[PDB]
């Protein structure tokens, strides 16, 4: 499947794509304001994620640091990124279908839209200004809005036991981005697409 990744933010981002233990395609790339990166992702990719990293410095060997979404200091990512990060999440060709969603479970750094470019399903969007409205205790000094599990590390936030409910903090994400997952056991907002669809992820989809 092809994913077109588009940067519509006014600042540079470093896109990242990974399935947790390996990179998807080159795994990562600078995208200036307006730029697009098309990647190819193996069919049957399960648990893929694409996200944005902000304020990064890399050297010529491609090692460095990012203010949000840093995946072990590498330009070309192979593991998941350090929160806070809005996540486009997907699983391809799973008994005939594709499954996509956007998640705030690891916080929020950049607004995002995640849409099929082929026919037969809808996209999802989480474009609201969460960083500006973030409750004091979730503000990341580094930029972005952390999720409550990252800040507080309790069973109730992390849904360690599998019995958690919504919390004051998850209700803030849900109120601002009703189409994204706000905590683990949130009522699913996954979209089912035909097997083998293609996709666009857009950072800052709105003006």
In short:
This protein is mostly beta strands.
How are the elements arranged and paired?
Blueprint: E1 2-7, E2 13-18, E3 23-31, E4 36-40, E5 48-58, E6 64-68, E7 87-94, E8 97-103, E9 112-116, E10 124-126, H1 130-133, H2 148-152, H3 155-158, H4 168-176, E11 191-194, E12 199-203
Parallel strand pairs: 1-12
Antiparallel strand pairs: 1-4, 2-3, 2-5, 5-6, 5-7, 7-8, 8-11, 9-10, 9-12
Structure overview:
With 207 residues, this protein is mainly beta. It has one domain: Thaumatin (Sandwich). The protein contains four helices and twelve strands, in the order ββββββββββααααββ. It has helices at 130-133, 148-152, 155-158, 168-176, and strands spanning 2-7, 13-18, 23-31, 36-40, 48-58, 64-68, 87-94, 97-103, 112-116, 124-126, 191-194, 199-203. The strands form two sheets. Strands 2, 3, 5, 6, 7, 8 and 11 form a seven-stranded antiparallel β-sheet that branches. A five-stranded mixed β-sheet has the order 4-1-12-9-10, with no helix packed on it. The chain is globular. Taste-modifying protein; intensely sweet-tasting. It is 100000 times sweeter than sucrose on a molar basis. Its main location: cytoplasm. Pfam families: Thaumatin. Disulfide bonds join 9-204, 56-66, 71-77, 121-193, 126-177, 134-145, 149-158, 159-164. One of its GO terms (cellular component) is cytoplasmic vesicle.
């Amino acid at each position: 499947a092809t994913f077109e990744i588009v940067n519509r933010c006014s600042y540079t981002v470093w896109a990242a794509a990974s399935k947790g233990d390996a990179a998807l395609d080159a795994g990562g790339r600078q995208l200036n304001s307006g730029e697009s990166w098309t990647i190819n992702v193996e069919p049957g990719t399960n648990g893929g994620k694409i996200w944005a990293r902000t304020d990064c410095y890399f050297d010529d060997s491609g090692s460095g640091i990012c203010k949000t979404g840093d995946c072990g200091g590498l330009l070309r990512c192979k593991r998941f990124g350090r929160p806070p990060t809005t996540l486009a999440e997907f699983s391809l060709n799973q008994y005939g279908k594709d499954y996509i969603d956007i998640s705030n479970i690891k916080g929020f750094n950049v607004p995002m839209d995640f849409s099929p470019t082929t026919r037969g399903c809808r996209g999802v969007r989480c474009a609201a200004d969460i960083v500006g409205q973030c409750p004091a205790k979730l503000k990341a000094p580094g930029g972005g809005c952390n999720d409550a599990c990252t800040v507080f590390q309790t069973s109730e936030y992390c849904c360690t036991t599998g019995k958690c409910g919504p919390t004051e903090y998850s209700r803030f994400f849900k109120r601002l981005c009703p189409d994204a997952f706000s905590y683990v056991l949130d009522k699913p907002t996954t979209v089912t697409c035909p097997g083998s669809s293609n996709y666009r992820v857009t950072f800052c989809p709105t003006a």
